[PDB]
Design a binder for this molecule. Sequence first.
Ligand SMILES: Nc1nc2c(ncn2[C@@H]2O[C@H](COP(=O)(O)OP(=O)(O)O)[C@@H](O)[C@H]2O)c(=O)[nH]1
Ligand SMILES: [Mg+2]
Length: 207
Amino acid sequence: SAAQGEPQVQFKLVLVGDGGTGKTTFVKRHLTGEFEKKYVATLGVEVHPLVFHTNRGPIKFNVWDTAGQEKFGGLRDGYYIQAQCAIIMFDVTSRVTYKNVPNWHRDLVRVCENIPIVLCGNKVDIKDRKVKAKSIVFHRKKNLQYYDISAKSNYNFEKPFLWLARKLIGDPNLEFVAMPALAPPEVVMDPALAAQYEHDLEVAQTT
Ligand SMILES: Nc1nc2c(ncn2[C@@H]2O[C@H](COP(=O)(O)OP(=O)(O)O)[C@@H](O)[C@H]2O)c(=O)[nH]1
Ligand SMILES: [Mg+2]
C-alpha cells in the first residue's frame, strides 16, 4: 500500500545445481545482496537478499546459496522447505551438469510442488560451448522457463528474476524499472555471439 511501515514483498528462492556450475558467482553479482548476506549455521546456507525495483514497487528474492554441500551429496529438506521459486543451474561447458538437471528437479519438486522454476545454462561467455540450444530440452515437459546466462559478464542476469516475479505476483506486465547495482562485468559477453545464441534458442523452441 501507499504508506510507510508495510511488510516487504519477499520470496524464498532456492538456487540449485551441480557444484562448479557458477551458482555462487551468479548470486554474488548483486552487490547489496552480497553485502547483506546472512549465513545460517544450522543449514549451512548463505541467504542473499536481492532487491529488484519493479513498476509496482520493490520485490525481494531471498536467494539461498549452498555452502558447497552439493559436492558431496544432495541438499537437506530444510534447504528446500517453503521455497516459493527456484533456479536450477547447469554449466554449458560441462554436459554432465545438464544430465544431472532432472535429478535436481526431482529433489526440488518432491519438497516444493508446483513452484515456478527457471532453468539457467551458465558460462555462455566461454567460446567452446558444449551444451547448445538444440540439446536443451528438459524445461519443455516440466514447464520451466529457460535462459542462457553468464554470471561473469552479467549477461541475462535479471531475466530469471523478472520471469519469476511475473509468475509470483500474477502480473505478466511487470517490469524492472532500474537494474540492481551489479559487480561490473569481468569479461565482455560478445554482442554478436549473444544475438546468435538468442536466435538459436528461438529456433529450437519452435522446433
Ligand atoms: N567463464 C565463466 N566462469 C564462471 C562463470 N560463473 C562461474 N564461473 C567460474 O566457475 C567456477 C565455479 O563457480 P562457483 O560460483 O563457485 O560455482 P558453484 O559451485 O556452483 O557455486 C569458478 O572458478 C568461477 O570463477 C561464468 O559465467 N563464466
Ligand atoms: Mg557455491
